[PDB]
Curated annotation (Swiss-Prot):
The protein's name in its UniProt record: Mitogen-activated protein kinase 1
Domain notes per entry: The TXY motif contains the threonine and tyrosine residues whose phosphorylation activates the MAP kinases.
Residues with Phosphoserine modification: S19, S236, S238, S274
Annotated function: Serine/threonine kinase which acts as an essential component of the MAP kinase signal transduction pathway. MAPK1/ERK2 and MAPK3/ERK1 are the 2 MAPKs which play an important role in the MAPK/ERK cascade. They participate also in a signaling cascade initiated by activated KIT and KITLG/SCF. Depending on the cellular context, the MAPK/ERK cascade mediates diverse biological functions such as cell growth, adhesion, survival and differentiation through the regulation of transcription, translation, cytoskeletal rearrangements. Acts as a transcriptional repressor. Binds to a [GC]AAA[GC] consensus sequence. Repress the expression of interferon gamma-induced genes. Seems to bind to the promoter of CCL5, DMP1, IFIH1, IFITM1, IRF7, IRF9, LAMP3, OAS1, OAS2, OAS3 and STAT1. Transcriptional activity is independent of kinase activity.
InterPro entries assigned to the protein according to its UniProt record, in alphabetical order: Kinase-like_dom_sf (IPR011009), MAP_kinase (IPR050117), MAP_kinase_CS (IPR003527), MAPK_ERK1/2 (IPR008349), Prot_kinase_dom (IPR000719), Protein_kinase_ATP_BS (IPR017441), Ser/Thr_kinase_AS (IPR008271)
Cofactor: Mg(2+)
Regulation: Phosphorylated by MAP2K1/MEK1 and MAP2K2/MEK2 on Thr-175 and Tyr-177 in response to external stimuli like insulin or NGF. Both phosphorylations are required for activity. This phosphorylation causes dramatic conformational changes, which enable full activation and interaction of MAPK1/ERK2 with its substrates. Phosphorylation on Ser-19 by SGK1 results in its activation by enhancing its interaction with MAP2K1/MEK1 and MAP2K2/MEK2. Dephosphorylated and inactivated by DUSP1, DUSP3, DUSP6 and DUSP9. Inactivated by pyrimidylpyrrole inhibitors.
E.C. code: 2.7.11.24
Organism: Rattus norvegicus (Rat)
Length: 346
């Protein structure tokens, strides 16, 4: 069994010429030469079976990525595991090799307006498909946007993804959340479990702002600081928007804060395209009910060079129902993972 910076990285007769590409979630990542297709590919070794949290993110992701087929969403090309559940200690996920991601790119490169527009287009194109499947990604951020050398973009990391559940979105004030702080919508801190599509649009608005300036727009250090960052730019919410918050504790918290006026987008982003800022405004709307939806965003004038609804496909087979993974033990998740990955066995 071949080794890499060991540790074991054994990917069978198909994948050769390994090179260690750092680490990721639950193990090591390498590129490899794929001998069937004669391309280099990315392979993630996943060892999740000791922790039920890792098992859930692994299963969730596999089920979703195997069902989805879209240009702007990373595919699973192959899955390598032992032929029996008993012998299966690890799973290897094979995906297209993408050179970089938007987090790495923004660390050193200024994007032209043309690049911002095309990246945003592809983010929203992929998101349209996801949302059309009744799925929420829930952790959109620059590092989950993979890029190649020709600017093709693909959304990755569906480990926190869920079937949309707007009827069950309500929760109390200061309910703990798992997804990445700087990209969390204000309602997550107030009254929302993040079970509606509007959570993802907020994250895209954060990403757009980050592309415009190469810095995160709302870099909170903790929970209420995240909200204070947001309120620092958007200003105090209107009485109408406060009235939509029925949660007394959340509403009263907002009423306790000193009044803040809106910081104009064109003062924050003086070099930005005006149409970009108009779209940004509509994505970073405080009230999630008033926030633009994915298809409206696609149709916004900023994206008019690319918008073509006939070439912005939707899912054939949406996930109608809640997957019921939260309430399943490690061992059971491992059995489902085995079944889900059977398709790739010779």
């Amino acid at each position: 069994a071949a080794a890499a910076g060991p540790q074991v990285f054994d990917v069978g007769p198909r994948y050769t010429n390994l090179s260690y590409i750092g680490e990721g979630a639950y193990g090591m990542v390498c590129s490899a030469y794929d001998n069937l297709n004669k391309v280099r590919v990315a392979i993630k070794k996943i060892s999740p079976f000791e922790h039920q949290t890792y098992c859930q993110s692994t299963l969730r992701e596999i089920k979703i990525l195997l069902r989805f087929r879209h240009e702007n969403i990373i595919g699973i090309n192959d899955i390598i595991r032992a032929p029996t559940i008993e012998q299966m200690k690890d799973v290897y996920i094979v995906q297209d090799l993408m050179e970089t991601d938007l987090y790495k790119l923004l660390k050193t490169q200024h994007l032209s307006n043309d690049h911002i527009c095309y990246f945003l287009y592809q983010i929203l194109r992929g998101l349209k498909y996801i949302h059309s499947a009744n799925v929420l990604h829930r952790d959109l951020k620059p590092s989950n946007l993979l890029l190649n050398t020709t600017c093709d973009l693909k959304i990755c990391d569906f480990g926190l993804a869920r079937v949309a559940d707007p009827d069950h979105d309500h929760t109390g004030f200061l309910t703990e959340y798992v997804a990445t702080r700087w990209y969390r919508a204000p309602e997550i801190m107030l009254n929302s479990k993040g079970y509606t599509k509007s959570i993802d649009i907020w994250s895209v608005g954060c990403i757009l702002a980050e592309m415009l300036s190469n810095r995160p727009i709302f870099p909170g250090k903790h929970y209420l600081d995240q909200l204070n960052h947001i309120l620092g730019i958007l200003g105090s919410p209107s009485q109408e928007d406060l009235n939509c918050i029925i949660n007394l504790k959340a509403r009263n918290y907002l009423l306790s804060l000193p009044h803040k006026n809106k910081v104009p987008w064109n003062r924050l982003f003086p070099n930005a395209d005006s149409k970009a800022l108009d779209l940004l405004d509509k994505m970073l709307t405080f009230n999630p009910h008033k926030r633009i939806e994915v298809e409206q965003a696609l149709a916004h004038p900023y994206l008019e060079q690319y918008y073509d609804p006939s070439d912005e496909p939707i899912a054939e087979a949406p996930f109608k129902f809640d997957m019921e993974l939260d309430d399943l033990p490690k061992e059971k998740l491992k059995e489902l993972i085995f079944e889900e990955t059977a398709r790739f066995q010779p």
